[PDB]
A paper describes a structure:
Similar to β-CoV nsp1, α-CoV nsp1 has been identified as an important virulence factor that acts by inhibiting the host protein synthesis function. The overall structure of α-CoVs nsp1 shared the same fold, with a characteristic six-stranded β-barrel formed by β1 relative to β6, β2 relative to β5, and β3 relative to β4.
The SADS-CoV nsp1 and FIPV nsp1 structures were refined to 2.1- and 1.8-Å resolutions, respectively. Their space groups are P212121 and C121, respectively. With the exception of the regions encompassing amino acids 105 to 110 of SADS-CoV nsp1 and 106 to 110 of FIPV nsp1, all the residues of both nsp1 proteins can be built using the final models. Therefore, we could judge the characteristics of the same subtype and different subtypes of α-CoV by structural comparison. This comparison showed that the overall structure of FIPV nsp1 is conserved relative to that of TGEV nsp1 (with an RMSD of 0.53 Å), but it has several differences compared with PEDV nsp1 (with an RMSD of 1.87 Å). The overall structure of FIPV nsp1 and TGEV nsp1 is highly conserved, which shows that the differential amino acids (Asn2, Cys35, Asp71, Ser91, and Phe102) in TGEV nsp1 and FIPV nsp1 will not affect the stability of their overall structure. From the surface electrostatics, the structure of FIPV nsp1 was more similar to that of TGEV nsp1 and the structure of SADS-CoV nsp1 was more similar to that of PEDV nsp1. Compared with other α-CoV nsp1s, the ability of FIPV nsp1 to inhibit IFN-β and ISRE reporter genes was greatly decreased.
Author numbering:
A (entry chain B), B (entry chain A), C (entry chain D), D (entry chain C): 2 to 105
């Protein structure tokens, strides 16, 4: 029903990340659910000002919900109180942490 | 390293809940990690207004962190940006949801 | 399915209103859906400051949702972005307005 | 006095939408009030970040007021506390919901 992943958590580094059309992010979420999140970092919602992006009308991976989190494409302006953070393509340093995630 | 639990999520009902000395909540967390959370509900932090308690100076079970969550005694006024919600003893209804938790 | 109602809208007057247990507000919602809202006023969420009650752990009628609104018991601290306002027992002045409502 | 409509509600998808001179939106509101809102979506005000347009000095259909809502041309910058959302021409999916609307 869900899967555990190790993901690098970025709470310190300003990053400029790629965004993609909705259907592309759906596909990349499915890829990462199968293969893991190497090449991505998790930015907690409370550090969202670390994330810059050139096409903010396009999407990044969102992590949403209570408990085991759902993954779905979101804008960086996503205002839901259930937003945990974003999983974005970046090569900065951080702290590897354990997540438990499912596809929305 | 962690354990999955099904916990009733309460986002609708006001609950008056017991708080306890810090050391007692530590023991209650261990018991619940072993035996499950029947009779408790998870109240997300954005609905902290739902939760009231007798002893402002005593603690409830806090759910903290990014990813798989840590369990630790917290005050109901805990301001940490890492606070996900509370697990409190209450008899109200809710929605059963999956959690992945570890002892802090 | 839903019903249209004329309801006095209060955007100006401070009101002290009764709050009730959840089950009681459910019954009051059903009564008002059958018989109308005379004796109540609608306070829009943007003037929620106008409403006070002596039991802040008890409920009033909430008006929520997009389009035809749902009616359900809420606390005066209800933070949902879907909250339109409250329907509360009060005898103040206001502007009579047309609503379209259904029971949640 | 008013009419009920089924309208696709969009809370998920970024939409680049046409904006028009004020007088043209007046006429489009009249047409849609007669013929329905097929091809349009309702974006709630709390997801106004989803909507972009080319001419930010030109207008879209605004949904305003307490209760049965008024339809009136607005800018996407519309600051009124009575703004419920926008009805905009867009291709995306959504959730069909019932509305009760009148022309301002």
């Amino acid at each position: 029903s869900s899967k555990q992943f190790k993901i690098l958590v970025n709470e310190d580094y300003q990053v400029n990340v790629p965004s993609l059309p909705f259907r592309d992010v759906l596909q990349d979420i499915k890829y990462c659910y199968r293969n893991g999140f190497d090449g991505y970092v998790f930015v907690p919602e409370y550090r969202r000002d670390l994330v810059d992006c050139n096409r903010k009308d396009h999407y990044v991976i969102g992590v949403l919900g209570n408990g085991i989190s759902d993954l779905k494409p979101v804008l960086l302006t996503e205002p839901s109180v259930m937003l945990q953070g974003f999983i974005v393509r970046a090569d900065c340093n951080g702290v590897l942490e354990d997540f438990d995630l499912k596809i929305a």
